[PDB]
């Protein structure tokens, strides 16, 4: 049931990212309305700029968390699908790729990886020859809503915010800044 745990973690990350962007947008709108006036709360204006920076950094961190969680979930799902189908139909695949399996059965490491690359590039050329047809295929048998609700790709809001690159010094300074943010919020 590790698959379902992965899906639950991915959904939790997505919901956390969505609510973090919600409070982010609330922060920008509140800061804009307070900045509409002149010199009223200059110190609070600086605090609002700081909170905008903290919120955007934390949104970027949550987006990265969600991206890697989704990548892991997709990897595990495709691993499970390929594994089950391959136990179903491994004999014909072995028959069509016999010389490489005889090579891998007893040869040494260098010949092992030589057979590895022979098998892999032969199957790449076969795949690129076949995919010229480009037919359309639905999802798996019991993995329909898995590939439906998770999404083929992460949302467009998750790609325009993760392009900013922050060095580890920026990450740690923003982490401690959010630490005193949480300390103030507790009070």
């Amino acid at each position: 049931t590790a698959l379902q745990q992965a899906f639950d973690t991915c959904q939790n990350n997505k919901a956390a990212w969505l609510q973090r962007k919600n409070e982010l947008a609330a922060a920008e709108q509140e800061y804009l309305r307070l900045l509409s006036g002149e010199g009223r709360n200059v110190s609070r204006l600086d605090e609002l700029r700081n909170i905008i920076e903290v919120r955007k950094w934390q949104v970027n961190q949550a987006a990265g968390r969600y991206i890697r969680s989704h990548e892991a979930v997709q990897h595990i799902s495709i691993r499970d699908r390929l594994n089950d189908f391959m136990q179903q139909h491994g004999t014909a695949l072995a028959a069509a790729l016999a010389p490489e399996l005889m090579g891998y059965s007893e040869l040494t490491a260098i010949a092992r990886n030589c057979a590895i690359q022979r098998a892999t590039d032969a199957l790449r050329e076969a795949l690129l020859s076949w995919l010229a047809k480009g037919e359309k295929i639905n999802y798996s048998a019991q993995d329909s809503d898995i590939l439906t609700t998770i999404g083929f790709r992460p949302d467009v809001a998750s790609v325009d915010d993760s392009r900013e690159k922050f060095t580890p010094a920026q990450n740690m300074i923003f982490s401690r800044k959010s630490a005193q943010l949480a300390s103030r919020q507790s009070v």
């Binding site: 002149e38 010199g39 200059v42 110190s43 204006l45 600086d46 605090e47 700081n50 005193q180």
Partner: protein
């Protein structure tokens, strides 16, 4: 009635009210003596009197109450405060007290307090269970203060240069080392007026020594 309004007023208005209140030979002496005698005759008439100030405690425990306008001078304008107010009312040193005052009786040079109405801009009742200054755990300069006026003033360039060179923050500990003839006095007055204009909530005062 409230002595602050008749304290911050200039000498001319005070002397004019002196003649119009019935005492015309109260001009050739100190401001403290003038206000002391005027308030003495005013309270002798039997009218309501209000006072305010900042207190301090001597070595014996008996305390004085000075005024900000008089630069905390030991003139007659001070008000006697007993240690009993400290012992039951739970008032610490330097607490700003505003409320009723009592005309001192025979042998008492300084005024006394009848009751307290406001302590540190707060009700006297909840000032008893107030946390001490040293008991508060400190931190670093979390908040940032901006010295720019924002109106494009003709002298805003100095404040902007100060901000660029060394930003200032709340609760920070800073020094301005300077030789004489450095123009420091007016840059301190400039930052004082800047924080007064930009921040009307925080309290501002400037300490002048010798």
């Amino acid at each position: 009635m409230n002595l602050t309004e008749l304290k911050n007023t200039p000498v001319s208005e005070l002397i004019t009210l002196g003649e119009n209140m019935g005492l015309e030979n109260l001009a050739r002496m100190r401001k403290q003596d003038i206000i002391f005698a005027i308030l003495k005759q005013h309270a002798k008439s039997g009218e309501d009197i209000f006072g305010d100030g900042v207190l301090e405690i001597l070595q014996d425990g008996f305390g004085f109450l000075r005024s900000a306008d008089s630069s905390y001078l030991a003139g007659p304008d001070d008000i006697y405060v007993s240690p009993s107010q400290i012992r039951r009312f739970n008032l610490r040193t330097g607490d700003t007290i505003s409320g009723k005052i009592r005309p001192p009786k025979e042998g008492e040079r300084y005024f006394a307090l009848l009751k307290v109405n406001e302590v540190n801009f707060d009700k006297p009742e909840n000032a008893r269970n107030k946390i001490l200054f040293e008991n508060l755990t400190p931190l670093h300069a979390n908040s940032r203060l901006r010295m720019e006026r924002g109106n494009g003033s003709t002298e805003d360039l100095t404040a902007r240069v100060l901000d660029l060179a060394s930003p200032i923050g709340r609760g920070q500990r800073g020094l301005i080392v300077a030789p004489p003839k450095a123009g420091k006095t007016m840059l301190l007055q400039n930052i004082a007026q800047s924080i007064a204009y930009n921040h009307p909530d925080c309290v501002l005062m400037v300490l002048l020594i010798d």
